[PDB]
C-alpha cells in the first residue's frame, strides 16, 4: 500500500488481502475498481466495487461522482479509503485523482501529481485520462 | 430456509429492499433502474447483475455487530446514487433485519424522517421487516445523533 493523501490509500491486487495493515492504516472502505476481483478479507471493512475493466472504452466517468461521494463520507466519518485495482496503476489511480479533484479542490495536474508522487507507476489509460479531463470540466461548470 | 417472498419491494422512491433472491433478479433490477446494490452481509453473494456498482456492508445479522459504524458512509453512497437518477437495492439474506435497518437509517438521514416513520415505511413495504434488537438500539442512537 501507498498513502496518497490523508485518509486516502492506493493499492494493487493484494492490497485488500493485507488485513492487518488495513487495520493499521485505519481503512474503513475499500474501493475495488474491477469486475472480477476478490473482496477484502478485512473484517469490518466495507467494500464498494466499481465494475470496469482497465480499458479505454469502458465508462468510468459515470461512476466517478457516486464513488467519490462514498469515499468522502467514509473519510468524514473518521476513517480512510483504499482504492485498488489489479495493477495499482490505472483504474485505482483514476479514481484516486477523481476523488482529489472532487473533494480536495485540486486540478487534474496537481491531483495526479499527488497520486504520481505517492505511486510512481501511476498511469491511467488514455481513455480514462480523457474522462478525467471531462470530469474536471463538469466540476468547473457546476462552480 | 427459503427467504420470504417477494424477491424485492419498493420501500420509497428510488429505494428497494430485498432478500437473498433480490440480487438474482437481474431484470427487475434493470427495469427499476437500480444503479447501486447494498449487500448488508459478510457472506451473501453480490448482485450477479453486471455493471452495477455494489457496496458490501460486512455484518452478520447479530445484535453484537456494529452496523451503526457503517451507516453514514452507506447512506451517503445510496443518496449519491439516488441523486444521479438511479435507484438503490438494499438486501440481506432474509430481507428482514440488516437490509431493513439500512433502509430505515437511509430514510432518517437523507429523507429527514424520524425513526418512527422511517421504520413504518419499511415495515409497510416489507411486513416481515425486523431489525434485530441490537440494530434497533443502534437506530435509536443514530436518531438521537441526527437530532444534534
Numbering used by the authors:
A (entry chain B): 19 to 161
B (entry chain A): 12 to 159
Copy the relevant paper text.
Dual-specificity phosphatases (DUSPs), which are known to remove a phosphate group from both phosphotyrosine and phosphoserine/threonine, constitute a large subfamily of PTPs. DUSP28, also known as VHP, is a member of the subfamily of atypical DUSPs and contains a single catalytic domain, whose precise biological functions and enzymatic characteristics are largely unknown. The DUSP28 monomer adopts a canonical DUSP fold composed of the core region (β1–β5 and α2–α5) and two mid-domain variations: α1' and α1. To the authors' surprise, DUSP28 has an only partially exposed active site pocket and exceptionally low phosphatase activity, which together differentiate this protein from other DUSPs.
An asymmetric unit of the crystal contains two molecules of DUSP28, which are designated as molecules A and B in S1A Fig. Among all the 176 residues of human DUSP28, residues 12−159 of molecule A and residues 19−161 of molecule B are visible in the structure. Collectively, the observed dimeric structure of DUSP28 appears to be a non-physiological crystallographic artifact, and it is presumed that DUSP28 exists as a monomeric form in solution. In our human DUSP28 structure, the predominantly positively charged catalytic site pocket is occupied by a phosphate ion. This anion is stabilized by a number of hydrogen bonds mediated by its oxygen atoms’ interactions with the backbone amides of β5−α3 loop (P-loop) residues including Asn105, Arg107, Ser108, and Arg109, and also by electrostatic interaction with the guanidinium group of Arg109. Therefore, our DUSP28 structure is in the “closed” state (ASC1), like most previously determined DUSP structures, indicating that the composition of the D-loop and P-loop of DUSP28 is well-organized to serve its dephosphorylating activity. Nevertheless, a significant difference between the two structures was observed; the side chains of Asn105 and Arg107 of DUSP28 are bulkier than the corresponding residues Ala410 and Val412 of DUSP10 (top). This situation makes the active pocket of DUSP28 only partially exposed (bottom). One unique structural feature of DUSP28 is the presence of the proline-rich N-terminal extension region (residues 12−18 of DUSP28; A12SPVPPP18) immediately before β1 (left); this unique proline-rich region is absent in homologous DUSP proteins (right). Instead, it appears to play a structural role in sustaining the protein folding through hydrophobic interactions with neighboring residues such as Ala33, Ala34, Pro58, and Leu100 and via a hydrogen bond between its hydroxy group and the main chain carbonyl of Pro56 (top). In agreement with these data, the direction of the backbone amide of C103S in DUSP28 is toward the outside of active site pocket (bottom), and its ϕ and ψ dihedral angles are in the “most favored” region, unlike those of DUSP3, DUSP10, PTP1B, and PTPσ that are in the “unfavorable” region, on the Ramachandran plot.
